[PDB]
Amino acid sequence: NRENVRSSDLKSVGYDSENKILEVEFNSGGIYQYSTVPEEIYSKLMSSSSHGKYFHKMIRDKYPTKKVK
Amino acid sequence: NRENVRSSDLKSVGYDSENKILEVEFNSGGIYQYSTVPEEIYSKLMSSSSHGKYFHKMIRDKYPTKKVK
Amino acid sequence: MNRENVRSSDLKSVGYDSENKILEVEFNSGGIYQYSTVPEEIYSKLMSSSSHGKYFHKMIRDKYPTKKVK
Amino acid sequence: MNRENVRSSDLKSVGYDSENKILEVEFNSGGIYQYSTVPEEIYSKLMSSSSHGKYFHKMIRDKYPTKKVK
Ligand code: NA
Ligand code: NA
Ligand code: NA
Numbered sequence: 001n002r003e004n005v006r007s008s009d010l011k012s013v014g015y016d017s018e019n020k021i022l023e024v025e026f027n028s029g030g031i032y033q034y035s036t037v038p039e040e041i042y043s044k045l046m047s048s049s050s051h052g053k054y055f056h057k058m059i060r061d062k063y064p065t066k067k068v069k
Numbered sequence: 070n071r072e073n074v075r076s077s078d079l080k081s082v083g084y085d086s087e088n089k090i091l092e093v094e095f096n097s098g099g100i101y102q103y104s105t106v107p108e109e110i111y112s113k114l115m116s117s118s119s120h121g122k123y124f125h126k127m128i129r130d131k132y133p134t135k136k137v138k
Numbered sequence: 139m140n141r142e143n144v145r146s147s148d149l150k151s152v153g154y155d156s157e158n159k160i161l162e163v164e165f166n167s168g169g170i171y172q173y174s175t176v177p178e179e180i181y182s183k184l185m186s187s188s189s190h191g192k193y194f195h196k197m198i199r200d201k202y203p204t205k206k207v208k
Numbered sequence: 209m210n211r212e213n214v215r216s217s218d219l220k221s222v223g224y225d226s227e228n229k230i231l232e233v234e235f236n237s238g239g240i241y242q243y244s245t246v247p248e249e250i251y252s253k254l255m256s257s258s259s260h261g262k263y264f265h266k267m268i269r270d271k272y273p274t275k276k277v278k
Contacts, residue, residue, distance in 0.1 A: 017205045020131045035244055035273040036133050038105050043206050063133070064244045064273035078227065098209040099225045108201040113175055121227070127175075129228060130245060136232065136277070 007052030015042040023068070024055070031069040034059060077121035084111040091132070093124065104133040148191035154181040162207070163194070170208035173198060218261035224251040231272070233264065240278035243268060 002012035002025055012025040015037075022034040022042055041058060048054040071083035071092065081094040084106070091103040091111055110127065117123040141153035141164055151164040154176070161173040161181055180197065187193035211221035211234055221234040224246070231243035231251060250268065257263035 033273065036131060038133075039203070039205055061276065064242070064275040066273040067270060095225065095227050097226060099228070101225070101228055101230070107203055109175055110203065113177075125227070134228065134230065134244070136230070136242070 003046070005046075005051050007050060007055075009052030010055060013042075013046065013051070015039075017042075022059070022063070024059075025069075029069065030067065033066045033068055035064040035066070037063055074115070074120060076124070077119040079121045079124065082115065082120065086111075091128070092137070093128075099136070100138040102135045102137050103128060104135070106132050142185075144185075144190050146190040149194060152181075152185060152190070154178070161198070161202075163198075164208075168208065169206065172205045172207055174203040174205070176202055212255070214260055216260040216264075219264060222251075222255065222260070224248075226251075231268065232277070233268075234278075239276060242275045242277045243272040244275070246272050 001016070002014035002023060005011060005013050008027070010024050010026045014023040015021075016023075017039055020036050020038070022037040022045075023031065024034065025031045037059070045051060045054050045059065071081045071094070073081045078096050079093070080096050083092040084090070085092070086108055089105050089107065091106040092100065093103070094100045106128070114120055114123050114128070139153070141151035141162055143151045146166075148165060149163060150166045153162040154160075155162075156178060159174065159176050159178075161176040161184075162170065163173065164170045176198070184190060184193050184198065209223065209225075211223035211232060213221050217236065219233050219235050223232045224230070226248050229245050229247070231246040232240060233243070234240045246268065254260060254263050254268065
């Protein structure tokens with residue numbers, strides 16, 4: 001479900017628009033799920049010139065987060 | 070600016086079209102805020118049969134949820 | 139037919155799903171978006187309107203849950 | 209409803225909302241963490257536990273989506 005990405009930080013990104021869950025794979029190896037993420041956040045994250053900078057600015061710490069790997 | 074239709078087990082429901090945030094009170098006393106909730110989600114919440122059922126199917130776990138009281 | 143074409147300075151084609159209440163709008167600029175919990179009548183007024191752009195602006199956009207499909 | 213105070217070496221108050229599935233834990237460090245999709249019965253075993261901390265760390269932490277709120 002995860003579309004590949006470029007950042008020095010994250011490898012792939014998946015979205016469940018039906019349930020508002022973002023899923024991010026990171027280059028280190030960890031996979032993390034983000035809850036109640038609005039649609040355009042996922043859109044803006046995917047159309048950012050930098051994917052890693054948008055994540056730390058607008059996503060990390062600001063949505064409920066669970067680890068998956 | 071709020072209104073007790075109750076529901077399957079709701080208490081009171083209010084909204085801010087101007088800010089796109091929903092407010093919902095529960096029978097256990099709590100009141101929760103929901104952000105970036107589009108207008109018609111708030112409307113056909115209220116035209117629905119049982120509004121808790123809608124809440125639990127179409128709002129819970131889907132918008133930025135923030136305790137207010 | 140997925141989407142029926144539309145003459146507008148803004149909208150290109152519109153399609154509707156009677157079952158899951160999803161409207162699909164394509165724009166002359168290329169974007170495609172699905173609109174959830176859209177009532178049948180709302181899709182009817184949009185197609186019957188004399189300015190699809192003006193009806194879309196007033197009665198659809200930023201009012202129903204929006205998803206970008208293209 | 210506000211949080212209930214608690215006897216633990218790690219947390220100090222806990223509130224729950226059966227309908228929403230929102231847990232709220234206030235720690236003996238001073239943060240408040242909010243846990244989503246927590247079933248009603250996990251919250252009860254927590255308030256009923258001989259050690260709230262040993263239960264929370266084993267069963268709730270790193271098992272439900274978490275968000276810092278204070
Ligand atoms: Na980067
Ligand atoms: Na037009
Ligand atoms: Na303890």
